[PDB]
């Protein structure tokens, strides 16, 4: 021989190698591939369509008895690059595909001098995992990735791991943070399933566990919710007989009904169960309609509508009690004329003294309903805080 | 001979095999493929464009007389992997395509030692089926998938089933739940049609039947609909002569007219027939304009506009009836001066006693219209419930 | 010879067949292709960009003198499948392309024993046709599809029809209904054009004619338009001196100005001419500003602003006419005191009797303007109906 | 020889033709391609991203000395079709690419008997040109297309034009009108640039000039702008002491503040300079806040707040001037009682005569501010018209 | 030999060249590629998904010992074009890929007569860099591009630079301005990293630094923010006892609550930290609720609700102080009748003189709260300006 290059090694291997035949001497021994993954980013989690988008890195290796030389007498060449096309490559796919992601192709593989080839490639994957929105800002997710052969049986292609499974779980090395989702754990599991007798299919399940960072939503839905409670505490200080107190409490009720609709499109509500913040917005209405349905009771109670004098059953029940429970011939002709004038004024006087008494009752009930409304907001806001400190601690 | 591998089998088959010729000995015998499907997910059901998106799995098998060896003397090899490119593959397409979905390709097939090849592949499909939105939250759909050869006639390619058709119907095995659509049944049917004499085309129709889960829409359109009825029950308790009762009933009517428009874009209305909830929102207006068009009648009836005394035809018709039907020289010079003063006061007195009487009539009609409005809402809400319990039961 | 298969026919044809050369014996005889189409669906009609999207089916056939055997002595084989790659295939494209639609490829053709090949393929096409929105819900469209060779001249490739043109026009066989567009007619036409001397290019024009179903828009723009006229008929029943009648007529005018903007994005207005419903919304404003600009005239007319007595020119012109046109020392010291008291009351009396008279005039004009406003709506709504019955009939 | 076909010409050329070598005898003579374009449609002009989308047609031709036969003795064949793959094809790209448009491929070229090949192909292109939004409805644009070789130098590939440049400018032949953009001119220009010594690169610049049709925006932003000026001319006719005049002028000011925001997303504002209609909407506010800030001055001026009598400095300045500038023991015991009654009435009389005088001043200023507001709108609307007639003329 | 062309050079090289083998004589010497980039445009910076889109140009060169001739005796040919397919091409990818951009392919390379090939290609890239929105209109970004081999180790492929790194930093030559992002610097850096022992991977990091032009957002969020402060300065000039002052201050508060929501979707808020303009909108509310919560205090203070006389503790504290701190038998029978009349009038007089005194106090507090509100806006607006002049200067 002569010394052209290392390329006469590359002629020695790929002269009679056939691309399609599965590379083994005896047809009973299965080819054993060995995979490994690393999470890189989490592009999109679509709650409505149950579709999760993920870019990962990937590598795998398998042995074969056709690409096998002796390293001596080929000028000590140990490894080698060979293009991906001219090598038998196994088909390993994800069961949970719903679409084909766009990923770069890598046109080279390694080949060691025992037959061990290696294959690095990245791949974007769009899968379909089941999500739960039972507790919306504070939620973990548990989506699956299932690597399997698509055609070959378990006496044909078998799947193990590159590294130990304890080392895969704590591999948070290149993951992109600052991106709405925090990666916790990548847990592998082997499992064999059979859809029929004498047809077994090996598979390998990776479980990813991600947790949403709740900080983005404590300003987008907590801030306008408590803000339309601090207005109604200001709103009760209007005296009820003015006329704008009814017009005040309907404007912001309109103003909050716009808020429930313009947010609900950006907050998803998928299958069984509603998110638990949706209950905590209905209670925001019941402290707002009851605030509306008591000023209707006072305006009806304090008005000038030629009404009767208030009842002494409910005068000493209210006025003299609640200041200590919580709060604190020509002569007779003109005499006929003058007395008729006084009769036209004294019934004008009588109609105003009656209207003072209901108006006196109407302020005592307004201060009394103002306190228990102030205690209903105060006892509700402390229950909201103590369910936030339990989660935040540990 | 020698013993290189099993690959000398792979050289024995694919040495003179021609890819394009249809593989049969006698040209009169038709090649019979045999298909099978399993639903996996339902990605999108677009009501407006009548387009349905679905990811399924798929397998098929056919015989041929060129790939046929004896298993003895090839070291007992029974099955084999061969790349998909070097084999005649029949063209089986869906008639209802409108676009090409993106699906992974599988580069291998099996070949048994009688000639039976097999072919597993997944495929995303976007079809065009006719949808009905006649009853929007409670609806089944009946979309079709039609597998057929695209070119060959029925004496060239014929289609049967892998499994029995009773086993295909009850195959809900890998379907993704928790996803807006519940799969009920996949029903197969064979049918032969001819577009011309001496040109018959076999086909195979799969019917899918899906049912929408109505739970997502009982919070997005039922809750604000009944909520703007519980405000108007509070709204009638304002006394009509105050002035804000007209301003109250127009604000929420504005507030509901925003609601009909911001929802109608997310609820589709396609061909013939409107959805039956659209009728049940027009009746929500007729209990809201009539609630508006009666407070206009009371405010016109109770006002100070130098009006005449109310008519005794309609005084004893109303006031004395409806409390039992439902509800319950210097002397004469000053005498000229004083009597003229009393005349200026007694007509001031007379104009207020007239205005008390209409004001008395105006409250009796307000309580009477409040009851039959309270019975119109009550008799309408029970009809809404009993049409929900009939569907929910069985 | 021996009897391997029919495949020795497939070796007899494709042994020396050259793919690129146009297949004819004498170079002067033109190759004549023959096309045919069937509409399948109409995916999208974008009015703004003048782009129309359509999925059709398609077939064509041509003769050639190289693929020509005798059916005797090849075991009577009449037709044959040959892959699409190894055959000269003519380039027939649409002139109106603006993009490339995604369509499945069909890898087989037929070949008869005279040389006639056939070629079935479906193809999605996005074209650019000119649309008119002159009458928006009731409109036909006339878009063109032009099949032509892209390179070859008319002495090289010539185009005729498969079927008679009378049979193509009435082929509504597989078209998907229930989809916003109704197909009427597919009309073919042959035409030869030359862009230069000695360079003629054959082409074939198909005209499609589609008609929009107007039912979807009689609920999305007719219903809120007439609904904000039935409120203003209720709106005039408020007495004008109350104070909310000005506040009533501005709220719904705000409420309709929101409606004109939130709809106009979903209703297109392209080149020359506005759609004729846009005129019928401006007239909806002129019956709404004039309804606003007359209650401003009454409130200015009926008010307490120390005004003068109304003019007897316009008292007998109005009050006594329009009830028949349409509607129906100590003594003198106290005498100095008492007469000064009466002078302070009689000018209080005089200022109210003046304010009764304008207030009397103000109600007669309000009933008179209420009738001719009720006749202006009534005479306008019957003109709207009779332009709907002319189109609906025939 | 024999007479198989014209195909022995196609064997004579492509037997030893090598695809990759640049086809010239002497390596010093440059290959000269010659291009030409025709605009077809303008799909999208994205102002925000500075990206312009265009579909054009394209053709080019070049000579080579390898594809060259004598037309005699090959049965007089002058031209020929050859597939695009087996020919050296130059790389001509656009410098302004930002993405790859989707365009059909044409698999054939012509070859004449001197060596001149020809090549027709259409191509969608997305470029990046700089746009100016300095005057939004009335604007021309000047975007560039630069055809150049991407690798070869100017002694390797050189670019000229097919036709004369005067004939290219006035080629508006197949352009799709009725589509928001009117094509004016396509102007070619040759230019040679060098990025380094001894490395020159030929290029060819086409300038397109397009003009927006402004008709679509005279109904989407001119009509609601002048419409909320004809309401405020009606709005001043309310008398100021009524109470709704303040509530009237705030509702439509709210109503126009919604309008500025819901439009500004559909009207772009890119780099340096704001569009000149944005100035003409700020002036629409200054005629609307000043209309608001003068009714605040009148309501403060006309009110009952136990105020003092108006000053005679400003009484004869206003009231007596502006009607000609623009507008036009028992006895004494009862005497103690009666005089005290008159004292309680005469100060009630005095407080109303003071309130008549400010109320008299308040109407004269309201008519005076109504005229100069009516002249400020009138003098502004004529300036708006005369800037529209200058552009519309020529 | 003869003289066919230069093409016998192209036959001399590519006769025995093998495409897949890495082209070096001795397998120990690494192949050294050398890259260079130029920014062209910045298409999109998506803050929410942390994805940045960029179109760049790119070139690289490497040596090999197989493509090497002597320029003498081949008619002095120095360089040459060879198609890209038939040459070993190294795999250089970006680590930060999340998708595959669409870019044109260049089918030619140069080859010099020493072995140096060259390769020009453009490529669109979508990467994933970490963004900070800590200060929203005034922000620089620091995103990375990392060119590396994907498979080969550092004794196999090594990466250096074409030009000096000082020349790459100041290369702003073809960058498209007028496009929301200004390019500052492109800084290169070499770094070697090892993921394992005996496996080192060379890489090359380019840092891009871009700065947002803040001019687009000084009209979209600064202008309506200060505009709803100039209305409330007009808003306090209404006298508080009128009745519309409460209705005025709630309409624009509704009007600004719409503004905070319709803008917050177009302004992103990603990971840790809120943008600093979000603090400067909360302070816009605290100058707006406090403006609301003081007119509630005045309306409660000035009202007719049969209240008591104001306290002389707080009369001389306020009224007599703040004008210098800041602001400036028949006889007795009628005597029984007449004195009873005077008693009915003098308590009518007394109830109005009490209501004058609170009304006098209520105006002095309104002018006093008007000044310190005018100083709170003035002292806040100057702090906003001086934080704009520090950034604008240098
Ligand atoms: C659609 O538009 C074309 C416009 O070209 C119509 O074309 C005319 O068709 C008639 C026959 O119906 C020919 O005699 C004319 O010469 C055509 N016009 C031109 C300019 O060539 C076509 O009829 C239209 N479709 C319908 C249904 O009216
Ligand atoms: C579009 O912009 C180009 C800018 O380069 C204009 O270019 C100039 O064109 C004139 C001839 O019309 C040349 O003499 C100048 O040298 C060009 N300028 C430069 C900087 O090279 C072009 O005219 C513009 N189009 C129109 C219609 O005005
Ligand atoms: O893909 C991978 C990859 C995939 C799976 C497991 C592991 C890796 C590593 C590191 C070891 C663990 C590196 N990498 C890439 C990083 N660099 C770019 C391509 C690889 C080599 C260099």
Numbering used by the authors:
A (entry chain E), B (entry chain D), C (entry chain C), D (entry chain B), E (entry chain A): 7 to 334, 397 to 462
Could you give the paper's own sentences about this structure?
Serotonin binds to serotonin receptors (5-HT3Rs), a pentameric ligand-gated ion channel (pLGIC), on the vagal afferent nerve in the gut and on the chemoreceptor trigger zone in the brainstem leading to severe nausea and vomiting in patients receiving cancer treatments. In the present study, we have solved cryo-EM structures of the full-length 5-HT3AR in complex with palonosetron, ondansetron, and alosetron at the resolution range of 2.9 Å to 3.3 Å.
The isoquinoline derivative palonosetron, the only FDA approved second generation setron, is shown to have a longer half-life, improved bioavailability, and efficacy. Iterative classifications and C5 symmetry-imposed refinement produced a final three-dimensional reconstruction at a nominal resolution of 3.3 Å for 5-HT3AR-Palono (with 91,163 particles), 3.0 Å for 5-HT3AR-Ondan (67,333 particles), and 2.9 Å for 5-HT3AR-Alo (42,065 particles). The basic amine of the setron is in a bicyclic ring in granisetron and palonosetron, and a diazole ring in ondansetron and alosetron. The aromatic end of the molecule is an indazole in granisetron, isoquinoline in palonosetron, carbazole in ondansetron, and pyridoindole in alosetron. In contrast, most setron molecules maintained a low RMSD (RMSD average values of 1.1 Å, 1.0 Å, and 1.1 Å for granisetron, ondansetron, and alosetron, respectively), with palonosetron demonstrating the largest RMSD (1.9 Å) among all the simulated setrons. During the simulation, the palonosetron’s bicyclic ring displayed fluctuation and positional reorientation. In 5-HT3AR-Palono, the tertiary amine on the ligand’s bicyclic ring makes water-mediated and direct polar contacts with the backbone oxygen of Trp156 or the sidechain of Asn101 depending on the orientation of bicyclic ring. Palonosetron forms an apolar interaction with Arg169 with higher probability compared to the other ligands, potentially due to palonosetron’s pose forming weak interactions with loop C in favor of loop F. In 5-HT3AR-Ondan, the ondansetron molecule forms highly probable edge-to-face stacking interactions with Tyr126 and Tyr207.
